[PDB]
Amino acid sequence: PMFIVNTNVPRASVPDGFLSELTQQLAQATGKPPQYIAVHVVPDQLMAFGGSSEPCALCSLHSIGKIGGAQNRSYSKLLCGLLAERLRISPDRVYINYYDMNAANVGWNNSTFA
Amino acid sequence: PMFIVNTNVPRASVPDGFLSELTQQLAQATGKPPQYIAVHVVPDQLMAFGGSSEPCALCSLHSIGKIGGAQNRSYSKLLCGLLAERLRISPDRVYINYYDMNAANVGWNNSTFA
Amino acid sequence: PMFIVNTNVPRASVPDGFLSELTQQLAQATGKPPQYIAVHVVPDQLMAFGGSSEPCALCSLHSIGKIGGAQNRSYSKLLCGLLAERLRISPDRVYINYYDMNAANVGWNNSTFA
Numbered sequence: 075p076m077f078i079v080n081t082n083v084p085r086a087s088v089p090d091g092f093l094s095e096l097t098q099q100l101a102q103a104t105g106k107p108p109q110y111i112a113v114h115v116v117p118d119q120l121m122a123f124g125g126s127s128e129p130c131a132l133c134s135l136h137s138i139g140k141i142g143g144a145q146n147r148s149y150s151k152l153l154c155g156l157l158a159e160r161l162r163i164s165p166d167r168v169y170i171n172y173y174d175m176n177a178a179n180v181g182w183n184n185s186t187f188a
Numbered sequence: 189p190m191f192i193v194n195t196n197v198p199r200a201s202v203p204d205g206f207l208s209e210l211t212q213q214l215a216q217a218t219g220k221p222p223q224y225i226a227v228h229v230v231p232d233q234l235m236a237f238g239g240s241s242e243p244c245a246l247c248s249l250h251s252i253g254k255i256g257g258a259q260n261r262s263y264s265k266l267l268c269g270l271l272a273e274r275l276r277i278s279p280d281r282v283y284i285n286y287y288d289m290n291a292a293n294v295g296w297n298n299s300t301f302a
Numbered sequence: 303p304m305f306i307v308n309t310n311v312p313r314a315s316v317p318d319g320f321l322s323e324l325t326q327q328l329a330q331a332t333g334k335p336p337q338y339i340a341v342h343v344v345p346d347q348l349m350a351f352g353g354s355s356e357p358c359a360l361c362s363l364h365s366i367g368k369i370g371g372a373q374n375r376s377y378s379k380l381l382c383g384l385l386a387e388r389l390r391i392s393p394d395r396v397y398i399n400y401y402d403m404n405a406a407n408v409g410w411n412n413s414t415f416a
């Protein structure tokens with residue numbers, strides 16, 4: 075799986091260890107091997123949520139399977155929790171787009187997962 | 189709705205009020221409340237369009253519904269118009285990917301919209 | 303079509319002419335004219351792959367058609383090859399998401415491709 079967070083929070087406010095924490099927490103939530111998990115954090119962005127530039131985040135989680143109604147609610151609680159605790163972003167100023175990818179549409183190591 | 193613009197135009201060339209104008213115009217266009225609209229502008233990017241690095245933009249609009257043939261043509265006219273007027277980007281150097289998101293696949297506020 | 307590469311490798315390590323090389327190689331691979339190919343490279347990113355901050359890349363290729371099982375395997379070999387040779391990123395630390403876009407969902411030049 076791949077998790078991306080884009081935020082207007084400045085780089086200095088992203089605490090040490092954040093990428094590792096995301097990796098560990100996502101491995102456990104998705105059930106996928108930790109070696110599979112990619113994480114990407116993009117601070118200092120020019121963004122607004124509801125017209126306001128108070129701290130906010132726009133995120134995505136791509137996975138081959140492990141995406142669905144109940145699973146996505148669980149991921150959102152986990153991820154909003156982390157963004158609130160670590161980046162001080164209110165959960166109501168976070169969007170997360172979930173993508174269930176077909177194995178044939180994910181390239182890795184010169185080939186695909188298909 | 190979430191709207192993202194990635195561009196090679198420099199930050200100083202993004203005028204005051206641009207995020208607010210996008211928020212307002214997208215609210216009117218999508219029929220969604222502005223409180224729900226997120227906008228994200230990413231200037232100073234290393235990009236090429238059609239084999240040149242003249243001003244260009246790669247964008248996305250995600251919405252739960254309000255996506256379709258005629259609607260997307262209307263959004264493109266609106267958004268290319270704004271990018272041309274405000275960022276001086278030629279409409280023929282803009283791509284906008286449209287995504288009709290299922291409510292279960294959009295996380296917000298510790299849950300999803302499902 | 304549109305190709306995006308996000309990577310932790312430094313900007314200075316991206317060779318002069320890399321964008322043009324991607325443009326031409328993708329034109330040949332997809333059979334699409336170079337005038338329609340957009341490329342976007344984002345260096346110096348805060349990212350991890352398998353919990354490791356060694357060089358890695360997260361990429362996407364969007365195309366109207368020319369996406370599928372065999373084609374994506376071929377694109378993956380091509381693109382991992384280029385990232386390895388030019389950016390010194392190991393293929394086993396690259397993900398590429400493939401998207402077959404409907405023409406109605408791709409905006410361009412005040413309209414869509416539909």
Ligand SMILES: CC(C)c1nn2ccccc2c1C(=O)[C@@H](C)N
Nearest residue numbers: 107109110111182183187352394
């Ligand atoms: C092909 C599949 C098993 C696989 N996918 N994948 C994605 C990211 C990191 C490692 C791996 C991995 C492996 O365990 C090596 C042994 N091929």
Ligand SMILES: O=C(O)/C(O)=C\c1ccc(O)cc1
Nearest residue numbers: 169189190224250251252289
């Ligand atoms: O679309 C909506 O109804 C909304 O209010 C929010 C939204 C957030 C993210 C996204 O990818 C799509 C919609």
Ligand SMILES: O=C(O)C(=O)Cc1ccc(O)cc1
Nearest residue numbers: 075076110136137138175399
């Ligand atoms: O889920 C798996 O098995 C992966 O290898 C993860 C993954 C899923 C979707 C993506 O867009 C990127 C990576």
Ligand SMILES: O=C(O)C(=O)Cc1ccc(O)cc1
Nearest residue numbers: 285303304338364365366403
């Ligand atoms: O496939 C084509 O015909 C294209 O015009 C290139 C393209 C395809 C999909 C995109 O999201 C962006 C550009």
Ligand SMILES: [Cl-]
Nearest residue numbers: 142143144145
């Ligand atoms: Cl589920």
Ligand SMILES: [Cl-]
Nearest residue numbers: 143144145147
């Ligand atoms: Cl539930």
Ligand SMILES: [Cl-]
Nearest residue numbers: 174175176179
């Ligand atoms: Cl898919």
Ligand SMILES: [Cl-]
Nearest residue numbers: 256257258259
């Ligand atoms: Cl429509």
Ligand SMILES: [Cl-]
Nearest residue numbers: 257258259261
């Ligand atoms: Cl129409």
Ligand SMILES: [Cl-]
Nearest residue numbers: 288289290293
């Ligand atoms: Cl969806």
Ligand SMILES: [Cl-]
Nearest residue numbers: 370371372373
């Ligand atoms: Cl194919």
Ligand SMILES: [Cl-]
Nearest residue numbers: 402403404407
């Ligand atoms: Cl589509």
